[PDB]
Coordinates of C-alpha atoms in Angstrom, one line a residue:
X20 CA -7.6 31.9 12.8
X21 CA -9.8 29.1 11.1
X22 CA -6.6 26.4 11.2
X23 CA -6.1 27.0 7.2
X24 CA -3.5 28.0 4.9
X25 CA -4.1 30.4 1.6
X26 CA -1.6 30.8 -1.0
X27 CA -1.1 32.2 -4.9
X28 CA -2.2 29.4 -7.6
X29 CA 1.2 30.6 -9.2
X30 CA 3.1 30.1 -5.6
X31 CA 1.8 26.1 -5.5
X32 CA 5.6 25.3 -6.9
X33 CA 7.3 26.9 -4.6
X34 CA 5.2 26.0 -2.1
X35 CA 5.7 21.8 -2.3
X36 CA 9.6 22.7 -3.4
X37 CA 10.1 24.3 0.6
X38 CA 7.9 22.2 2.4
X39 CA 8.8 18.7 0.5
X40 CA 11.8 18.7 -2.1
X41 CA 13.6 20.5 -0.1
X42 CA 12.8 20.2 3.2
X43 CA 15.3 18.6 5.8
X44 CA 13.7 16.1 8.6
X45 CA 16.5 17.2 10.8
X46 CA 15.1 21.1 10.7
X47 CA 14.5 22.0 14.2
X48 CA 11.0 22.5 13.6
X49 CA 10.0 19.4 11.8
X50 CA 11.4 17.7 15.0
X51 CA 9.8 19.3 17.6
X52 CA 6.6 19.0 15.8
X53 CA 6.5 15.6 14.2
X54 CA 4.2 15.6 11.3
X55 CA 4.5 19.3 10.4
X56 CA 4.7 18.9 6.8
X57 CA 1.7 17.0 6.6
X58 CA -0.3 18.8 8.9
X59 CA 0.6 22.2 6.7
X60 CA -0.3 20.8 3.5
X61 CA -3.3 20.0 5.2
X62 CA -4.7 22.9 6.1
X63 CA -3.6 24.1 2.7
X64 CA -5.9 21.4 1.3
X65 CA -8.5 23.1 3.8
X66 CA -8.3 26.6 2.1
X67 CA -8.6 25.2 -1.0
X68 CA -11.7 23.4 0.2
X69 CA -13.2 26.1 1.4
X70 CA -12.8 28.3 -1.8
X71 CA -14.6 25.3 -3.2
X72 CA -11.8 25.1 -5.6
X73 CA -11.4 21.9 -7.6
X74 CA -8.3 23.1 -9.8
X75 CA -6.4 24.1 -7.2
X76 CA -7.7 20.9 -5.0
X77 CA -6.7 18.5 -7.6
X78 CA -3.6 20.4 -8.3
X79 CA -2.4 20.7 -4.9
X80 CA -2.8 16.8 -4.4
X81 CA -1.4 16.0 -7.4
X82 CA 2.2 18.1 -6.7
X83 CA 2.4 16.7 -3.3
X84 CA 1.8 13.1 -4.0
X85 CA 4.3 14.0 -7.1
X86 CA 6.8 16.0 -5.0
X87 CA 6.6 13.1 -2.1
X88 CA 7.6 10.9 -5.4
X89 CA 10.4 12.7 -6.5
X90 CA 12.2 12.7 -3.2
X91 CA 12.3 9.3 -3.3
X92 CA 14.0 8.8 -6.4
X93 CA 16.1 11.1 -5.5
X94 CA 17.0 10.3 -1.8
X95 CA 15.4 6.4 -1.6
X96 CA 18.0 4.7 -0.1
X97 CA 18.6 7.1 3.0
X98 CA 16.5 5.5 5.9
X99 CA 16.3 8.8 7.3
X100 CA 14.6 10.6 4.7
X101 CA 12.2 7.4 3.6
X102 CA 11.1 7.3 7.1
X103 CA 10.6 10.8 7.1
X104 CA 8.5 10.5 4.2
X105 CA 6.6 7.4 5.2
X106 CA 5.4 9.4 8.6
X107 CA 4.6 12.5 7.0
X108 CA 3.2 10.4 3.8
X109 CA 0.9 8.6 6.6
X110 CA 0.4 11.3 8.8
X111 CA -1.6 13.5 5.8
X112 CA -3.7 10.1 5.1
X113 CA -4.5 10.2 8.5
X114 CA -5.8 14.1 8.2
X115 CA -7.4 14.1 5.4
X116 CA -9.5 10.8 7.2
X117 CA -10.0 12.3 10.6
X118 CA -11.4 15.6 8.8
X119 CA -13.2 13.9 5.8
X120 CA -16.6 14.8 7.1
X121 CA -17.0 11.2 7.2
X122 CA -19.0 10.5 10.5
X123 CA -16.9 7.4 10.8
X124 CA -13.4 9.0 10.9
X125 CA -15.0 11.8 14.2
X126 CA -15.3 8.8 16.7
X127 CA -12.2 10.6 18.6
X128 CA -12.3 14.1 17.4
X129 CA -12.8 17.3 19.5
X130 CA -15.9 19.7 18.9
X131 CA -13.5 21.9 17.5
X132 CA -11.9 19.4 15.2
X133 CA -15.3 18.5 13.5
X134 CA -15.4 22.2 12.8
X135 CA -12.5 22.1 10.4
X136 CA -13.3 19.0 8.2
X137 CA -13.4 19.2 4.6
X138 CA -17.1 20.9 3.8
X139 CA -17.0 20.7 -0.5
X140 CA -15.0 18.1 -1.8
X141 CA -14.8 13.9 -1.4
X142 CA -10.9 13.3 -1.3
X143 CA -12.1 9.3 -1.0
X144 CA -10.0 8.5 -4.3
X145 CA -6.9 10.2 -3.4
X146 CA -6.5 8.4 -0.3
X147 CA -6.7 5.3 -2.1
X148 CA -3.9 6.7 -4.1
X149 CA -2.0 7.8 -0.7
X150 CA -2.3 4.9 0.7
X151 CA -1.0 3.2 -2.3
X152 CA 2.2 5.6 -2.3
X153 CA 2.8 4.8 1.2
X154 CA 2.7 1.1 0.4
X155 CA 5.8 1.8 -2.3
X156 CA 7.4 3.7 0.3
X157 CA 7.3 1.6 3.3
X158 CA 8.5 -1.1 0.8
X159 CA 11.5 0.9 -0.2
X160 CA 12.0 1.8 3.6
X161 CA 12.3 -2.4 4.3
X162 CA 14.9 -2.5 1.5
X163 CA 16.7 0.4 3.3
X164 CA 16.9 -2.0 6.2
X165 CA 17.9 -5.1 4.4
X166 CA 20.6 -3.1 2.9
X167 CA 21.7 -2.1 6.1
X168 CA 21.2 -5.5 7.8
X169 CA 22.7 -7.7 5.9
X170 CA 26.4 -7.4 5.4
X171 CA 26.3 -7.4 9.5
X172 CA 24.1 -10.4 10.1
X173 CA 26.5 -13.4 9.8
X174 CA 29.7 -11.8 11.3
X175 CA 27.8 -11.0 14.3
X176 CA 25.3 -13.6 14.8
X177 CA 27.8 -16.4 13.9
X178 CA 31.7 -15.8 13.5
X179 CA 31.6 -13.3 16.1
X180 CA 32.2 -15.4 19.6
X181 CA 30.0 -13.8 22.2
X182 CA 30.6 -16.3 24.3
X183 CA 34.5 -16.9 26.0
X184 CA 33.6 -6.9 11.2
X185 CA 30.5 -6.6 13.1
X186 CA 29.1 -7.8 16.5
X187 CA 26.2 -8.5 18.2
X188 CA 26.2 -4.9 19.6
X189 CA 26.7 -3.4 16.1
X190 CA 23.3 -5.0 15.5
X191 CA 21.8 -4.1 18.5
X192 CA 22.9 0.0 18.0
X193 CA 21.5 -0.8 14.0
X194 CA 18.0 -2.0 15.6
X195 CA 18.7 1.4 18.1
X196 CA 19.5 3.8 15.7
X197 CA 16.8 2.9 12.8
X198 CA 14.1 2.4 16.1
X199 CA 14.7 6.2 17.5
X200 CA 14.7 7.3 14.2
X201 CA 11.4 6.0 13.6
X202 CA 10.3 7.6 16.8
X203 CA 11.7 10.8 16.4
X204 CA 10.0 10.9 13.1
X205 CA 6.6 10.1 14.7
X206 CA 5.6 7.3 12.7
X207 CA 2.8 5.5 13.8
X208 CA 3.8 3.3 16.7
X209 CA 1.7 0.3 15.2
X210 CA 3.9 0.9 11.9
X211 CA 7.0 1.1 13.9
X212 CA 5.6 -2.5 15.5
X213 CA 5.5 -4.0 11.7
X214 CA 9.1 -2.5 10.6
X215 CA 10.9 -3.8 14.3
X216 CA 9.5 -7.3 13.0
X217 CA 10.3 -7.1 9.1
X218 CA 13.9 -6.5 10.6
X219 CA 13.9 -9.8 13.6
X220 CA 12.9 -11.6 10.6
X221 CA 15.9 -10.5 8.1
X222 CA 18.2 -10.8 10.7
X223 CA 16.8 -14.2 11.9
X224 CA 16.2 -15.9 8.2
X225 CA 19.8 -15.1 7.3
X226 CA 21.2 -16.4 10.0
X227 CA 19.1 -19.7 9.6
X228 CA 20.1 -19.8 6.0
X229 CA 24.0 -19.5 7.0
X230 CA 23.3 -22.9 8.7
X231 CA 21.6 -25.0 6.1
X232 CA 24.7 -23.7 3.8
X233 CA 27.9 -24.1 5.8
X234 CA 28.6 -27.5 7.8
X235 CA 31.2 -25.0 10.0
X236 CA 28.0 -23.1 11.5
X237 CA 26.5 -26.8 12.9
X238 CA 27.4 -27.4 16.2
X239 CA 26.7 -27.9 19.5
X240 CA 28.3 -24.4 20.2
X241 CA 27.1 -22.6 17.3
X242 CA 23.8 -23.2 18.8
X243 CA 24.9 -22.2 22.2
X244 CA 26.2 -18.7 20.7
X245 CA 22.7 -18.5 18.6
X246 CA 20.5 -19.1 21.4
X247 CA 22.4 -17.0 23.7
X248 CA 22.4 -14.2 20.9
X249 CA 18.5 -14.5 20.2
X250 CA 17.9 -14.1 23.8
X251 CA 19.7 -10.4 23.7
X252 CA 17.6 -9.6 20.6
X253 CA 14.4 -10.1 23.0
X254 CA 15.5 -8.2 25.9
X255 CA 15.9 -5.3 23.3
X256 CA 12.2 -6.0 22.4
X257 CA 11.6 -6.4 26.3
X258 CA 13.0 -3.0 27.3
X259 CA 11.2 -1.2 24.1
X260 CA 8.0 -2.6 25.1
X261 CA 7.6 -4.7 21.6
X262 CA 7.4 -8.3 23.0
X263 CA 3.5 -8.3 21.0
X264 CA 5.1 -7.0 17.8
X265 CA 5.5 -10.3 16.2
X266 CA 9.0 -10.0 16.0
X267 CA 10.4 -12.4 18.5
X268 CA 8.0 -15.1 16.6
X269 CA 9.8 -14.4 13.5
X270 CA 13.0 -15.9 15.5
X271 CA 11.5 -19.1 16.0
X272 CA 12.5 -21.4 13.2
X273 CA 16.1 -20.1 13.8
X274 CA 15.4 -20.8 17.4
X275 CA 15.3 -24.1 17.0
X276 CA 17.4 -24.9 14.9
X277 CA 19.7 -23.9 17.5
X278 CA 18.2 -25.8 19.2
X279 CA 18.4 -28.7 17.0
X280 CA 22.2 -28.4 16.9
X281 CA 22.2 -29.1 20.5
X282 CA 20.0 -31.6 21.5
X283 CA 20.7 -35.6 21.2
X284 CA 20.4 -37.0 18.3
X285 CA 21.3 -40.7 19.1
X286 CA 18.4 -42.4 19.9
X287 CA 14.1 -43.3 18.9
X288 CA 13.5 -41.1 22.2
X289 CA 15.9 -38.4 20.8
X290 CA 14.5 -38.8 17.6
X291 CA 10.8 -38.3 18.7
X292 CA 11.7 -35.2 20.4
X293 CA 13.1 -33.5 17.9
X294 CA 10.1 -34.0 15.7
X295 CA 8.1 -32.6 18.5
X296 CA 10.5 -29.9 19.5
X297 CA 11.0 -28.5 15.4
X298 CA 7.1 -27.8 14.6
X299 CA 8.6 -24.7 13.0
X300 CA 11.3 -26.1 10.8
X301 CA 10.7 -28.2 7.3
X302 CA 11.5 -31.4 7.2
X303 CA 14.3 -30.9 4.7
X304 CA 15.1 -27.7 6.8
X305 CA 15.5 -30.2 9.6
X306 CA 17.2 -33.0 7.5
X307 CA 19.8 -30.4 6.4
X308 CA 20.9 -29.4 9.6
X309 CA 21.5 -32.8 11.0
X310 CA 23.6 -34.1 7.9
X311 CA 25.8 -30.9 8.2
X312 CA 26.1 -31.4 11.8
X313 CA 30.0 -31.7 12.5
X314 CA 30.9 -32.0 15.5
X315 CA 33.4 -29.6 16.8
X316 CA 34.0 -30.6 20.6
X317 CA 35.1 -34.2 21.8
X318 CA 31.6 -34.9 24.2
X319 CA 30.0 -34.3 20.4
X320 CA 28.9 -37.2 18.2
X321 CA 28.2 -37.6 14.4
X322 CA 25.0 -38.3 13.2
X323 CA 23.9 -41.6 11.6
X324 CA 22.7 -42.0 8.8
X325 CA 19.9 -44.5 10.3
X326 CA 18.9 -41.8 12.6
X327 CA 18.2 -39.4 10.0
X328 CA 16.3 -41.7 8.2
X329 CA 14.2 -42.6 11.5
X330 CA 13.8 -38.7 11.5
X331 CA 12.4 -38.5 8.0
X332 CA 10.1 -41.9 9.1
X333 CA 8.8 -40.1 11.6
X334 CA 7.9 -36.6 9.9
X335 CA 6.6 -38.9 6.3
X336 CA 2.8 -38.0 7.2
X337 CA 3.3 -34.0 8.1
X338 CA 3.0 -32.7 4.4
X339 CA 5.3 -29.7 5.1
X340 CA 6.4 -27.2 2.6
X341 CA 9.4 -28.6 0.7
X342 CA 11.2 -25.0 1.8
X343 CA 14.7 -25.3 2.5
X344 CA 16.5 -21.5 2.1
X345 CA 14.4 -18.3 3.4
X346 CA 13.9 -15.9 1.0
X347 CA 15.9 -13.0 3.1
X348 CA 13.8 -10.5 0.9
X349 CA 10.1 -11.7 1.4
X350 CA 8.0 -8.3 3.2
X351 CA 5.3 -9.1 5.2
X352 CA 2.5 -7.3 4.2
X353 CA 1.5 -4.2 6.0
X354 CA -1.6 -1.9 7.0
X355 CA -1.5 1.6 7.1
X356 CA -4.7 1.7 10.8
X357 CA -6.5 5.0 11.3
X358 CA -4.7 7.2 13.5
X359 CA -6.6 10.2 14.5
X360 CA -4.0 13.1 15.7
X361 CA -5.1 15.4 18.6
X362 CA -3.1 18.7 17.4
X363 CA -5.1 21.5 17.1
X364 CA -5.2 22.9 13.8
X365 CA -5.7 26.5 15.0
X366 CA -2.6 26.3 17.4
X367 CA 0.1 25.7 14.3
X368 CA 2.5 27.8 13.7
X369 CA 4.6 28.3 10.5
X370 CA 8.0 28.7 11.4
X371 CA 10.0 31.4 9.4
X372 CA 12.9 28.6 9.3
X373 CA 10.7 27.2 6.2
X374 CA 10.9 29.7 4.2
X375 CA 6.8 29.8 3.8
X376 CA 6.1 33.6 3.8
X377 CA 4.2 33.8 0.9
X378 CA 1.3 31.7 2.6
X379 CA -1.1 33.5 5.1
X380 CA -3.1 32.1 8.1
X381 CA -6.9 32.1 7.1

């Protein structure tokens, strides 16, 4: 057994209809081997290779990419079955690098693996194309999460009193549940890394934006609650090892303004320290928060007018962006790093649960 897969030219439909359209990521088999799709069609692509057969190279390619499409549009805003498809989607970039032939892509492969890379055909182009698909889909993924995210993000990083609708710890079982997910699916941990911060920054920019629009979020307290809320986000990070993810920096603007809300705000000295403290907030991010500023307990005092203006003396030679609201939406921009697998082709096994009996082991 050579680690390929042969099938009929006429069975190709059938063959990306069980193993993509249709095929469930919570199957059994899919979970205990994450990847398995990809790693299949793989060693489909290899037979095909080695028959040194372009039609039914290009025409394999060309029904997965096109079946990994149409399960999107059909199924796009599930999380479960994007992410699915965003592993799997990677995870067959990934094989068709490590066994390009290119010398470049063997640095980590086993004697046995450099046996089975591709011996006839340059597949260059169609990872370009891959890689381009996983793009779209790890896009649509981050939309997944907004969608998700956002109708819980003020209730329970604001009106939610955490401190003696949704809560902090709906949140924090959201961040779980999308997280395992992710990991159960086998997605690249350095992928995972980029999606936990995409989320710390949806979930942080709509809770900044909250305060720059409501005068009932600026206080003293708020800020308490935000701070104390922000430090339970990074203990999540702390216990899932993610604390050089990015994602706690994305809290930092939000940060402090909470901190903003509770500092003093009376005097040159308080006024200097503040333009210290906020390097991370706009100056009209800044100038907003302290005109909404109402106080709401008895040891709190308004604002004046001539402090804010000392503030905006004092920041009139930093040329900051004139950004006040956060667009909630922005996606950071995201790679797609080699990630050589150490499964041995020649060990896979089809399970009958995928209904692929018309393919044979080469």
């Amino acid at each position: 057994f050579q680690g390929m897969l042969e099938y009929k030219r006429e069975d190709e439909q059938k063959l990306v209809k069980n193993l993509i359209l249709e095929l469930k990521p919570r199957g059994v088999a899919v979970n205990l081997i994450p990847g398995l799709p990809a790693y299949i069609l793989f060693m489909c692509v290899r037979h095909a290779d080695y028959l040194n057969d372009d039609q039914k190279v290009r025409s394999l390619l060309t029904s997965t990419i096109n079946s990994i499409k149409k399960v999107l549009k059909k199924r796009g805003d599930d999380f479960e079955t994007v992410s699915f498809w965003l592993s799997n989607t990677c995870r067959f970039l990934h094989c068709l690098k490590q066994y390009s032939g290119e010398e470049g892509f063997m640095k980590h492969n086993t004697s046995r693996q450099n046996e089975h890379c591709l011996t006839n055909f340059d597949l260059a182009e169609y990872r370009q194309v891959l890689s381009d698909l996983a793009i779209q889909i790890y896009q649509q993924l981050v939309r997944v999460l907004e969608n998700i995210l956002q109708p819980m993000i003020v209730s329970g990083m604001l009106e939610h009193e955490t401190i003696q609708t949704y809560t902090l710890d709906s949140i924090l079982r959201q961040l779980n549940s999308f997280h395992s997910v992710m990991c159960q699916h086998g997605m690249d941990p350095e992928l995972i890394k980029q999606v936990v911060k995409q989320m710390f920054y949806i979930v942080g920019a709509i809770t900044l934006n909250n305060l720059l629009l409501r005068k009932d979020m600026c206080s003293w307290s708020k800020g308490m609650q935000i701070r104390y809320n922000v430090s339970q986000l990074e203990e999540w990070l702390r216990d899932k090892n993610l604390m050089n993810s990015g994602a706690k920096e994305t809290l930092e603007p939000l940060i402090q303004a909470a901190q903003l809300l509770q500092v003093k705000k009376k005097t040159d000295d308080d006024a200097e320290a503040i333009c210290s403290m906020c390097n991370a907030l706009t100056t009209a991010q800044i100038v907003k928060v302290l005109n909404l500023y109402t106080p709401v307990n008895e040891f709190e005092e308004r604002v004046s007018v001539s402090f804010i203006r000392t503030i905006q003396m004092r920041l009139r030679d930093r040329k900051d962006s004139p950004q006040l609201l956060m667009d909630a939406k922005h996606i950071f921009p995201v790679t797609f790093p080699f990630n050589p697998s150490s499964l041995a082709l020649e060990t896979i096994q089809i399970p009958a649960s995928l209904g692929l009996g018309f393919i044979a082991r080469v």
